[PDB]
Design a protein around this nucleic acid. Sequence first.
RNA 1: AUGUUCAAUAUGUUU
RNA 2: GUAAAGCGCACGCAGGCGGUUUGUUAAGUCAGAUGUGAAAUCCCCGGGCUCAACCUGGGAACUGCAUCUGAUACUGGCAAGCUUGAGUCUCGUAGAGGGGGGUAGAAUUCCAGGUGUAGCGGUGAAAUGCGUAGAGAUCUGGAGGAAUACCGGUGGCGAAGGCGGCCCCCUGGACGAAGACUGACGCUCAGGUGCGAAAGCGUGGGGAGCAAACAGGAUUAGAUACCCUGGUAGUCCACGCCGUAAACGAUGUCGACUUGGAGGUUGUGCCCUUGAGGCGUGGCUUCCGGAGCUAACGCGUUAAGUCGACCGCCUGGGGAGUAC
Lengths: 129, 88, 218
Amino acid sequence: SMQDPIADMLTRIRNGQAANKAAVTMPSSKLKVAIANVLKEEGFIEDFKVEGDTKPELELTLKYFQGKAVVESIQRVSRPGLRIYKRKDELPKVMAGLGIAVVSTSKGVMTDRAARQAGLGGEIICYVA
Amino acid sequence: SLSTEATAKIVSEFGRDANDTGSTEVQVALLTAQINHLQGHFAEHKKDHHSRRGLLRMVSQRRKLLDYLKRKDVARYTQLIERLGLRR
Amino acid sequence: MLKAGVHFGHQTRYWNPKMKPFIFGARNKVHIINLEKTVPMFNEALAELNKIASRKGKILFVGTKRAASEAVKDAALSCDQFFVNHRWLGGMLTNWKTVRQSIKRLKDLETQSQDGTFDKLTKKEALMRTRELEKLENSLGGIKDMGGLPDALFVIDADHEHIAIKEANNLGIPVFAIVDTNSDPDGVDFVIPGNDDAIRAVTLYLGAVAATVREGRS
RNA sequence: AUGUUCAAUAUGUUU
RNA sequence: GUAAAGCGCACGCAGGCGGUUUGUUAAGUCAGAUGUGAAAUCCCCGGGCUCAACCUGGGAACUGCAUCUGAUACUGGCAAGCUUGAGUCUCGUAGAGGGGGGUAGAAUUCCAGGUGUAGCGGUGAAAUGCGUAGAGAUCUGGAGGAAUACCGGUGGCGAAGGCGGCCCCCUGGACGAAGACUGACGCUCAGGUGCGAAAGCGUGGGGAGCAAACAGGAUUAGAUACCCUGGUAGUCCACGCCGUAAACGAUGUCGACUUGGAGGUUGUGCCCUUGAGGCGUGGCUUCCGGAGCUAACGCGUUAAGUCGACCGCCUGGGGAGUAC
Ligand SMILES: [Mg+2]
Ligand SMILES: [Mg+2]
Ligand SMILES: [Mg+2]
Ligand SMILES: [Mg+2]
Ligand SMILES: [Mg+2]
Ligand SMILES: [Mg+2]
Ligand SMILES: [Mg+2]
Ligand SMILES: [Mg+2]
Ligand SMILES: [Mg+2]
Ligand SMILES: [Mg+2]
Ligand SMILES: [Mg+2]
Ligand SMILES: [Mg+2]
Ligand SMILES: [Mg+2]
Ligand SMILES: [Mg+2]
Ligand SMILES: [Mg+2]
Ligand SMILES: [Mg+2]
Ligand SMILES: [Mg+2]
Ligand SMILES: [Mg+2]
Ligand SMILES: [Mg+2]
Ligand SMILES: [Mg+2]
Ligand SMILES: [Mg+2]
Ligand SMILES: [Mg+2]
C-alpha cells in the first residue's frame, strides 16, 4: 500500500522507458528530487521539474539514445524490507564502474564515485546501469 | 440505518459543529450508536452472518479509531470513552 | 498541407496503437492522418529515392491489392523499375536462389512462345504451356528482367504486403512503405503515412515515386 | 443396447 | 496457473512495513581515532636449510567489540504540521447480499367421487410391476410437501461458501456527483477468532417428488453395475455438531506504473435531446490481442508484464498425507 515511493519512482522510470514515453510524472518528494538531480547530472535522465505546491508533481524527461532507452536497468537495492548500508570501501561498482549506484551519504545523496571521492558511504538507494 | 436525523444529532452532539462530521469523536460515536442499535437486530436474527460481518467491521473500525485517539491525545480518549460508555 | 490527393484520412477503430504520432484527431470513427507529418517524411522518402536511383537503383514496387496493381505497373514501367502487381511470392528476395530459376523458366517459355515451338507440339501440351507462361508473367512479370537483387522496396500497404517487408528486413534492403493507420510501422525504414483504399491516392503516390526515381536516373 | 484378455527382445557413420 | 508448492474465505493481537513538510535528537547509519581483537596459522615482501617441504624476520589481516569526537542524506524516537492514502457526513442508484414472516400459480403424488374400459407402464428388446377387486385416460373437489417455468442474460450481489415467484419487516455492503469534515488514523498478519457447498451426526418435527442402502426384473460368461420396476435414510424445517470439496480465475492480500479493440452492466456531466443521438467521466465485468513474461501452453491494465510490503507454502517418485 505504497510503502516505498522511491521504488515506485524507479519503476515509473523503468516502465516509461519500456513504453517509450517522453515524460514521466509522479508525486514529488525531497528524496525523489535529490535522486532525480543525481540522475540528471550523471546523464541517465533529461531535465526535470518539481511543479506544484500543495500536491507537488515531479516531471522527469526520459532519454533515448538511438531508439533505445538510456536507463538500461534501474534496480532498487535498499528496499524498506531490507536496508543496505555500505562503508566507503564496500560501495558497489555497477557494470564494473560504468554504471552508477545512487547512495545516500551524510553529505547528501550522491553517486558511488562521488561518495568514494568524499570518503564516506551510506545507504545504497539504487543501481542505475 | 441510523437515519439522517439521528446521525446529524450525533454529529452536533459530538463534534466541533454540525459541519464537523469527520472528527474521530463523531466517527466513534456514530459507530457506537449503530452498534448499540444493531445489538437488537442480532438479538433474534442470530443467523444473520452476512450483516454481522459488517457489524464486526464497524466494531474493528471503532477500535482502530479509538486506538488512534488514545495514542494521539489521551485526554480526549478518556473523555470520549467515559462519555460514550465503553471499555467492556 | 493538402498538397494534392485524398490521402488525408483512412481506416477506422482498427488502428494500430503504434501509429499514434500520425493520427491527427479522427472525426467520425475514421482516423485522419496528420499531413504536417506526412509531407516532410514523404519528401524525405523521395530524397532517399533520388539518392539511391543516383546509384542506378533497383527499386521494387510492391502493390498487390486490386487498387494499386495497375498504377504500380504503369509507374514502374514508366520509369524503368521492377514491380509486383499480384500476390507476393513468399521468398522472392530471401529465397532468390530458386526464384531466379523460375524467372529463367519464364524467359525460356517466353522466347519459345515468340520464336520457338509452342505451336509445333500437342495442342493440349501447348495450351498448358501458354497457361503456365501466363501464370509466370502474372506473378514474376516485373522481376522478369531484374538483374540480381533490389536496392529499395516501395511497398504500398504495409499490412497487406507485410511478407515483402519482413523479407526485405532480414536482407537489409530498405523499405519505403505507405503506412496506413491500421498498419505496423516497424519494418518500414522510411514510412509514408497515407491512405491505401483510394485508387486516386495510390496513383498520386505512384506518380510521385516514378517522377522522383526518373529524376534520380542520371 | 451390453461385448473380456494378450509376457517378455535387435538398432549404425566421413573429406 | 498446468511440473512440488497460494491457507476455503475473511477479521485481527504480537510482528513486519509505512504518505508528505519542518524542527529536534543522534539510536540505526557513515567518518576518523583510542583500546582491543594472544601467539601460531592464512596472505604479501624477504631471508636460512644445496632446492623444496620446513623454519623464520617484518608487515598485512584478524572483515569483530566497546568507548570518544564528528555528518545528519536515509531509517528510527519526540513535537508540530499537510493532504494527494485511509475514513465520516448530505443526496441518489442498482442488486437472486442476509435474517424473519406471509401469500401466489404451475406441476407431481395421494384421497373421495363421475365417465369409461382393456389395457397401462417400461425398454435396445423385454420382464418385474399396476390392471376386470376397473387400472391407465378424462373431469370435479380436498389434502400435503418441495421448488419457483417464462423473465434469464460469459446478467447481478456477496470475503468465500453461496444467493433467483411476489409482498412486508429488520439489516450489511458497494458505487456515483458535488461539497464540507478528521488528518496517516494505513497495508499485511504467525497464534487466535468467526463464516464455511454437499455429504454426514444429534434431538424434535415433516415427508409430495427424487433417491444411497435394499428387493425384484433384465443384460451377462458372472453383473452384489450401467438399464427397468418399486423403495428406506437423506434431501425439507428449528437448533446444535462436522469443518471438509477439482472449497478452482488450480492464480494470497494491499499498492503503484505500462500500447489497444469489441462488448455487458450500473452511475454521472455537457451538447443539437435539435429521438431512442453525439461527446466525455466513474465502479464492476466478458472476449481478443501488443510489448513484456513463460519450458511451452498461455497470461496479457481484473498480468502469469515492471516493482514495493506482509503472509502462506515447496524441496525426486512411492511409502504417505499414512503411522505414533
Ligand atoms: Mg485374465
Ligand atoms: Mg501441482
Ligand atoms: Mg484462493
Ligand atoms: Mg499488528
Ligand atoms: Mg516515511
Ligand atoms: Mg549513531
Ligand atoms: Mg594473531
Ligand atoms: Mg632460499
Ligand atoms: Mg598490523
Ligand atoms: Mg532524523
Ligand atoms: Mg526524521
Ligand atoms: Mg487540516
Ligand atoms: Mg492463520
Ligand atoms: Mg458452525
Ligand atoms: Mg446437508
Ligand atoms: Mg437430520
Ligand atoms: Mg433406481
Ligand atoms: Mg484442502
Ligand atoms: Mg466452488
Ligand atoms: Mg489450490
Ligand atoms: Mg489474450
Ligand atoms: Mg490422518
